[model samples]
Target: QTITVWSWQTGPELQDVKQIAAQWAKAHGDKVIVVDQSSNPKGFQFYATAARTGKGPDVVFGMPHDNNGVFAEEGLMAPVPSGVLNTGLYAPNTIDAIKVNGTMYSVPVSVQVAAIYYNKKLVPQPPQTWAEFVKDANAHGFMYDQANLYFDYAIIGGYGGYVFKDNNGTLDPNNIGLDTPGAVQAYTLMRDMVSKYHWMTPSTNGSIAKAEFLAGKIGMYVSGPWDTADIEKAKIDFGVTPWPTLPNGKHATPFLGVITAFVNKESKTQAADWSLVQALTSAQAQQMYFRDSQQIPALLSVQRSSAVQSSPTFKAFVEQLRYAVPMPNIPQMQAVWQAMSILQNIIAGKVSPEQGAKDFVQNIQKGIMAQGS
Candidate 1:
């Protein structure tokens, strides 16, 4: 029997999976056909349309964890069978990320989140608290993409702020927290980081910081695992660690995003497709994915593998997952990200942080209300 898999990944990420599928085919005496739909919108539309006609691929790859809610809720995806894949072998947060309404619908492949990457040559031991980091950043230099609100949200979360309140495993869009005291404090600190401490400028971005780090001009920077290969190519000695505790003594919780493999509900060969999913998420396959794509593996066991455990960067990412929060999986989240862009402008000096935070909360409230209607 032959199984078909659809994915949006086109380059090395897709190729890595092709190799794994080929290996599975050889082992099971079955054929696995891989297709690249090229873009997310196209892949999603293809799955939705084809599933209605019972003509979709058996499995789909590279679906975002948040997308699982709508797809599974709409009856487009099959609930992934329990005990076939080692869900326990994945990080608790990632496992939660792929579940919708208490049911698992996909197999997690990789995860991404921001962390502090520092030049050990510059700082022997990474800082443990915001105050310590501030002092060190002043002596040396700390840089992050000033415009990237994703990084800013991590700081906001450290201060006990969130875009929406979690209400029994679901986000309450009405409970906007962007203008809360903790949020105001977070934005205030960011503003000061740029204007007061001079660690980074509003114009400074990830690309600039990465280049500066490579040239040995900065001591520490905020980035995800995706930046590791180039940094290693530059041969800069660095240590990976979670963001230091905020001055309030809280962990900096970054947004955790995972790429997942989902099984289509319309497929005839359900068992075969699940077997393929199992193969794709297996320790060996995830290990291969990381080796090729530099993505952090979602599997806890693979994360603890000798190779991954030895690498400081991967180790830090896995450790940081414990403090991470999943991005809201609802469509209302669109309004949240849009509202955050306004807050980003304030951080970049387009407006006062106080004013921005106030306007952000108001705008988010309006947006969510509009979305509900």
Candidate 2:
């Protein structure tokens, strides 16, 4: 019998999974059917509709964000077995991201942090200081990915700040950190880059920006491992390096975004689904995924694999992974983003950074407080 799996990968990248699935089918006696979907708005709309109607695929790939958690809480998703996540198979941080309260929810594939990519022809050595970076990038390329929280997270981390932190170091939901001095400083730096230095890219969708950068119009960009192929295809002098040093000297850490396959409790084939999830999460499958797909692996053991270590991009990614931190893992994260929209307004020159952060805290606080009440 076949269990349906769903994801939104397409193009050459999507082909990588098809090859893996074919290999898995040959090895296992059972059939695994992959249901391909788009990653854009319509695909997500379909997922949302399916979740409410219980018509979604048996297993779906989702990020550890509001969409998946909300569906799980609504009973649209089922609990992933805690036992399956033996420490041997995954990094401690990967497991931590998928857990809600005390229960596990997904089988992780990769954890990626953003890196600053530069054209090697422009500069042989990636700049070690932000000031040096600005001089070089302004001459050759530009710093970019300047829309919303995606790239903004790195800016926040650049200043040794984060969205939230608790007494114990875990990101704190109650203590949103955007209003802090360091975070505000990061936002200020971002606006300066865009408005004064001309180091940041002008407003353009990420895809278009990437394409232009690959075409050699832009010099440096903050992007993740998923774009490795594109960088290679561009065939320009290129290298990946850490984000520029912040004025305060803290490492700029990007939000850790992971891709994971999770089981749907409501699937008709619970036993079969468990088996499939386990097989997929196995170090072997993860190893294949990393080596073949250019994804950073989640399994602790796979990172040491020669195949993983030898990739041209591996060293660069490993460099950034040391500083990658997971975002807050609460239902209130949605509230946080809602508040961040105000930051966007400020960055776009519609308001002052002070007003943006202040307004965000006020609005998001009301949302969280209402949820509690």
Candidate 3:
């Protein structure tokens, strides 16, 4: 019998998974596994179409948390059986993000969260508060992607904005929170980052931020673990720090991200699919994962182990990851992403934060209505 695994990993990371899956298969009745990068890389419709028809990979090796809800709600994914992963050991919000309506749908293996990266050459000590960060950034240079909701949400959430209201893993899509008073404050802060503090312009984005940062034209930027290699290669004296405080006296709430493996609902080899899930999330698997990818493993034992804790950058991120919350794992998130142009409009000074917050909420609500979800 053969099993299929679907994920978007490429090159070495993809090869690493294949090796592990093959090893796991060899011992389990010489089962064959087909690693697929083509099936459902990004298009939500591909999954909805293929999975709804009960004809896709048996195991989804590394899907983002946001995809859990739509598939699980549609009966396209199986609820993770008890004991496949000991949920007690995962990082905060890692396991919870894969759950829909209190039922978990995947085994979370890795996690990521953004943090403030400061050039030590410009500012010797990382600012502990936004007031200080802004002052130091002004004195040096601060640039980040102004239009990206991923980075902007840190400020928005710090000012008390949220995508949806959650009650014990049950998310109410109707109760949107992007237009709250605190969200307005976040919007104002973002406006200042462009107009007042001169951190970034509307044209600035993650790629531009990286280019400028690499060229030593930027002092500080908000980015995640994935950008570490470039920064290191550039030989910038960089320091990763936990988020600074906002007007509300809370740290910026960056979206916590987790990479999970989902099991298809219609797999004939359901038992074996679970076994493969366990194999992918196993402590040994996670150790190899960290070794190959340098991603933060969700397993507490692996994350807190000596190899991981020794790195100061990892220490800062892990400390802040405790404060991070997973982005809403609901089908309505599609509408939210499409509607984030409000973030860009506000930064470009096309609309006032107060009005943008209100419009942002309205657009998402309308989008949800259009989708009839």
Candidate 4:
């Protein structure tokens, strides 16, 4: 019987997986059928539709954002073995995101963190302060995504802004912190980058920023590990740097995104399905994928692999992740993404920011409290 597998990669990874699949086919005697399950416009449709109808694949792959929690709450996911915990085996923040009620929901394969990718030919080191970044990006030109949630938060955090104020003074989910003075300063920095500095193009988000970087039209861009391949393929001389310190000296926290294979709890072939996921994310496959894609490996051991550590790019990402923070894994995360969209709409001139924030809070509260923590 065929073990159907799905993923979102379309580039070098697809090519690499093609070879790996062929190898698996030979070893398993045609026991696997790997399917490309990625969707544009929105990638969550496959998993959501599948879970609702019980028509989903035996396995699924997605980000560590709110969707993971929402899917888990809906009974759309399976619990991973407790053995996969710890940064010694998994990327530190990724481990935190996949855990829910103390159960692992997925096996992390790769991670994406927010950081500035600068062209070494144009910029040796990034500006140390947000003020310096404004001047440098203007003089040299840069790109950033207005639509990416993590980058948005990074900008806010960089400016000493926050989403909410926890009792201890860190970010708190109970209170939406978008309207605070610090958040306004963060918003002002973004606006000034467009209006005064004129370094970043008026594009919406990270994908566009990657495109600009690939075209060599921008000196620097804020991106994650996912963009490393396209940059290398384009042959750009790049260097990665942490986000500059805000006026208050706090670095921004980018949304920590974890790419992983998730098994279906409903699969009757639990043994076979888990076997496939394990094989796919195995140390050998993980190492090869990381090297081939020029990405930071998920397994800590791979960091010591000469092939991965030798790259300056990967090293930069390692340093940058120190500032990373896992996006909330609670069910209320949906409200956050919903609020993000509303905020983006306001930025796009479709609504007033104040009204948008108001509607966002109300809509998020709807049907949420009933679930209970």
Per-candidate RMSD vs. true structure? 4.0, 2.8, 3.0, 3.4
How do the residues 1-373 of candidate 2 rate in per-residue lDDT, one tens digit apiece? 7767786644454565566666766876667777777655664436657766777778775344434555555566677755766755666777777766656777777777677778877677788787787788778867455756767787787666666675663556777777788777877887777678766534654677688778887777777666776677767677778776776777777777766777776789876677766666567766756653467777777878888888656777777777777766666776666665676566677877777778877888887777643
* Candidate 2: 10-residue stretch with minimal lDDT: 62-71
Model 4 C-alpha lDDT per residue in residues 170-209, reported as the tens digit of each score: 3356676666666666665655565566655445566777
lDDT of 1 by residue, 337-360 (tens): 667667557767888878888888
Provide the lowest-lDDT 10-residue window in model 1. Answer: 38-47
Residue 333's lDDT within candidate 4 is: 66
lDDT of 3 at 266: 88
lDDT of each: 0.79, 0.69, 0.79, 0.67
Candidate 4's error at 159, in angstroms?
3.8
For model 1, name the residue pairs that clash: none
TM-score for predicted model 4 compared with the true structure: 0.85
Quote each prediction's TM-score: 0.80, 0.88, 0.87, 0.85
lDDT agreement of model 3 with the native: 0.79
In model 3, pairs of residues that clash are: none
User: Between prediction 2 and prediction 3, which has the larger lDDT?
Assistant: 3
